Design goal:
- The structure is a homodimer.
- The first copy, chain A, is mainly β and 340 residues long.
- Chain A folds into two domains: 224 residues, Green Fluorescent Protein, CATH 2.40.155; 116 residues, Immunoglobulins (Immunoglobulin-like, Sandwich).
- Helices cover 0% and strands 51% of the residues of chain A.
- The first copy, chain A, has no helices and 22 strands.
- In chain A, the strands form three sheets. Chain A has an eleven-stranded mixed beta barrel with strand order 1-2-3-11-10-7-8-9-4-5-6. In chain A, strands 13, 15, 16, 17, 20, 21 and 22 form a seven-stranded mixed β-sheet that branches.
- The interface between A and B is medium-sized, with 32 and 34 residues.
- Chain B: Belongs to the GFP family.
Chain lengths: 340, 342
């Protein structure tokens, strides 16, 4: 419903009033988000003069509604679902061996503009530490924001550890705890556990003498696979011996699709071994393994098997299971070794 | 860069295929829209000759790699868009294993606002009772990596890949592709280094179309070359109290203009920062676990970074990664060090 708003490039406005250890400041920023590409372009300015904290410490605080949710996960996007009326975003950010940011923001549409308005309160910072002492490199790393649903408050919670590069070669950790709740009474999408993969790049406007930050960001949602295969049963076995592989299938009925086994020996190419028809009325085997190997499936437990008999050293490989439901899927594989 | 600009928006596609396989003749026509920025394709094809003598999946690779998504760092490596608007000739030999062969020749150029793929296809030596002419192939398509090399003589590229066709009896029908592209104009073009296209396709049908047809959704994105890369070495099995030295080879940036760090991940634990040194090289830092035992350094000449590990304990067992941020964070694949008795 709210997703329709993010189809195009949307003008962004960011407004932050901070206080850290009594040091007060204001940040203002403008740009355009594109959810369609999961892209952000913004320029921020300290309007109060010089910024008392490093710019990277403000990055996570300064619009996750611009994240790119792939089609399959679009049901899991809380952020766009709460718009235009928006959501409240609250964080407690703990810098290790140093002070803490506490933040409260409202991200809503005002006119055609999406507005992030934040109040930020820092405390317990060491004046000689990495933040107030400006010891952090100007850049930003890539992180995964782990999202769970908050059903009690009709919103989400998030947990992630931000890694800030320190100029002496060390790292400054910022523990993020996040909770969002929508502004309106309108119903919202509450997702299952997933994560946002975020990468940012920081820079400066060559012509700008005010204390500022130019920010490009890419966020894309992930962490749920519609289909999953897990192989099991691999082991080390003497020549002439026998073992059985099992694959646990998820995301689809095993009896509505054909399933195949592949194997890859070291240095050689991955080859098809065995397979069976979706109906289960036909099964096929590659020439190397014919008569030795047998494929089968259990419709009830949604699992597929490969029985391997009269094993030879040449059968040594990593064995994979394979299915195509609109898309091809593989398992992580399982290692069988035949020696001597 | 002239030719990239043609692909900035969603552009209409038209495909027209004329073919003969074992004397059986047919024509295919298709249309839709490509988006190169996301590398997405949406097309609908129709056999205009009546019923198609071959399975639709066998025509997929023949039926516009200029719509592949080449990421910013690899944009110098995009031959396909560089040949536009004049376009390129794409030629393939497709050998179906234990069966016949396709020969294809295509011209992909812009005509008006629509990018047009026009193909001649000649099949021969096909078994009338085989998987192709006997229609034994499932209606679907798998995911493949298309390996692209430059062919410098022809001012263009070559490709080699194996398409895997699912057969209805549970088996697989292999189609070996041999590909060569050459530009239509003499205008200079981008010749890439070795890389690959990661392609996924999905097939479906239009409910209101009674003609023999194929509805195709495709996702292609280029990969296999990073502007910046870290490769660790030196991981091994080591006795407690022993020593080993890890090295990381860096590419795409001077090791002396950027800070480099080492991280490690023990099994079941979270990845932790171990050691690092300033971009200038005047400061280096170490975590409490490793303090005094570990030493980081770098060789500006060989553009390499080291980690010396002394008085090793079992707890030092982990995969060790090297880390740098040039505009983006980069990791190596890591190297495994194991500390245990013999």
């Amino acid at each position: 419903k709210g997703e329709e708003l993010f189809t195009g490039v949307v003008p962004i406005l960011v407004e932050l009033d901070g206080d850290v250890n009594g040091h007060k400041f204001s940040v203002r920023g403008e740009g355009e988000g594109d959810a369609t590409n999961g892209k952000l372009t913004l320029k921020f300015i300290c309007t109060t003069g010089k910024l008392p904290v490093p710019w990277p410490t403000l990055v996570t605080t300064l619009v996750q509604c611009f994240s790119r949710y792939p089609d399959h996960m679009k049901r899991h996007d809380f952020f766009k679902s709460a718009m235009p009326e928006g959501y409240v975003q609250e964080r407690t950010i703990s810098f290790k061996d140093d002070g803490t940011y506490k933040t409260r923001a409202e991200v809503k549409f005002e006119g055609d503009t999406l507005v992030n308005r934040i109040e930020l309160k820092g405390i317990d910072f060491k004046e000689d530490g990495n933040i107030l002492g400006h010891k952090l490199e100007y850049n930003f790393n890539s992180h995964n924001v782990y999202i769970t649903a908050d059903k009690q408050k009709n919103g989400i919670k998030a947990n992630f550890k931000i890694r800030h590069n320190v100029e002496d070669g060390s790292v400054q950790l910022a523990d993020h705890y996040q909770q969002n709740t929508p502004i309106g009474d309108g119903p919202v999408l509450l997702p299952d556990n997933h994560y946002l993969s975020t990468q940012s790049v920081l820079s400066k406007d060559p012509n700008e003498k005010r204390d500022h930050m130019v920010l490009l960001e890419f966020v894309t949602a992930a962490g749920i696979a519609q289909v999953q295969l897990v192989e099991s049963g691999g082991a080390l076995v003497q020549p002439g011996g026998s073992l059985r592989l099992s694959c646990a299938a998820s995301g689809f009925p095993v009896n509505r699709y054909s399933m195949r086994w592949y194997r890859q020996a070291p240095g050689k190419e991955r080859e098809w071994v065995a397979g069976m028809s979706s109906a289960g009325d036909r099964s096929s085997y590659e020439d190397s393994v014919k008569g030795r190997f047998t494929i089968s499936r259990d419709d009830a437990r949604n699992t597929v098997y490969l029985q391997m008999n009269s094993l030879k050293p040449e059968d040594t490989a990593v064995y994979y299971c394979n299915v195509n439901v609109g898309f091809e899927y593989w398992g992580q594989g399982t290692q069988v070794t035949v020696s001597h």
